[PDB]
């Protein structure tokens, strides 16, 4: 239902399915479906959720790598950064997003970058995952339009909870 720019394919899943849990485990796999390279420092990804009792939070990138169309392997775990943002206009299943960014790296055509993430409230208290917009339980990465990706701030994949889609589309 949701339009895409066509430069990225975003696949996704949460590896922890429990409704009540004190870590959320978003996993991203972003493929460059264009024929020109992408500078990863211009890519951001957002996972939208409800914090369920505002407390400070921490994000860990447990692992990230860029994998070439032919199989080359570049570890970039230490290049991945997370920032928690309280939304200026919440929706029913989103008052916060985790925004993932990168300090460097290059995504060639056909390459993909995998990001395995984890976040918690600093006191390890519970979240509820059933009121989280971006949550998606699966056994492997699947295409998922409720996480969003941006190149230099321009939305190219997914639908924001507030309704925004790729510019010029409906």
Segment contacting Cl ion by CB under 5 A, of 30-38, 62-70, 83-91, 138-146: 138-146
Distance in Å, CB of 46 to Cl ion, minimum: 9
Distance in Å, CB of 68 to Ca ion, minimum: 36
Q: Are 14 and 129 in contact (CB under 8 A)?
A: yes
Distance in Å, CB of 128 to Ca ion, minimum: 5
Give the three-state DSSP class for 141: coil
Distance in Å, CB of 147 to Cl ion, minimum: 9
Residue 113, strand partner residues = 30, 66
Residue 145 binds which one of Cl ion, Ca ion, none, with CB within 5 to 8 A depending on kind? Answer: Cl ion
Q: Where are the alpha helices (DSSP H) in 2-161?
A: none
Contact set for Cl ion, span 144-163 (CB under 5 A): 144-145
Instruction: Pick from 57, 106, 114, 131 the residue near Ca ion by CB under 5 A.
Output: 131
Q: Where are the beta strands (DSSP E) in the chain?
A: 8-14, 20-21, 26-32, 38-39, 43-49, 57-67, 73-75, 80-91, 94-102, 106-107, 112-121, 127-128, 142-143, 148-151, 154-157
Instruction: Pick from 50, 79, 96, 148 the residue near Ca ion by CB under 5 A.
Output: 50
Instruction: Pick from 128, 138, 145, 151 the residue near Ca ion by CB under 5 A.
Output: 128
Q: Residues interacting with Cl ion, by CB under 5 A?
A: 54, 144-145
């Amino acid at each position: 239902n949701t339009p895409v720019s066509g430069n990225l394919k975003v696949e996704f899943y949460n590896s922890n399915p429990s409704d009540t849990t004190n870590s959320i485990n978003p996993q991203f796999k972003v493929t460059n479906t264009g024929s020109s390279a992408i500078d990863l420092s211009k890519l951001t990804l957002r996972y939208y959720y409800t914090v369920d009792g505002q407390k400070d939070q921490t994000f860990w990138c447990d692992h990230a790598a860029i994998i070439g169309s032919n199989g080359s392997y570049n570890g970039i775990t230490s290049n991945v950064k997370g920032t928690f943002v309280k939304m200026s206009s919440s929706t029913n299943n989103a008052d916060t997003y985790l925004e993932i960014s990168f300090t460097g790296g290059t995504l060639e055509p056909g390459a993909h970058v995998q990001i395995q993430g984890r976040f918690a409230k600093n006191d390890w208290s519970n979240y509820t995952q059933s009121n989280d917009y971006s949550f998606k339980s699966a056994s492997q990465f699947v295409e998922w339009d409720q996480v969003t990706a941006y190149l230099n701030g321009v939305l190219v994949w997914g639908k924001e909870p507030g309704g925004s889609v790729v510019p010029s589309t409906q």
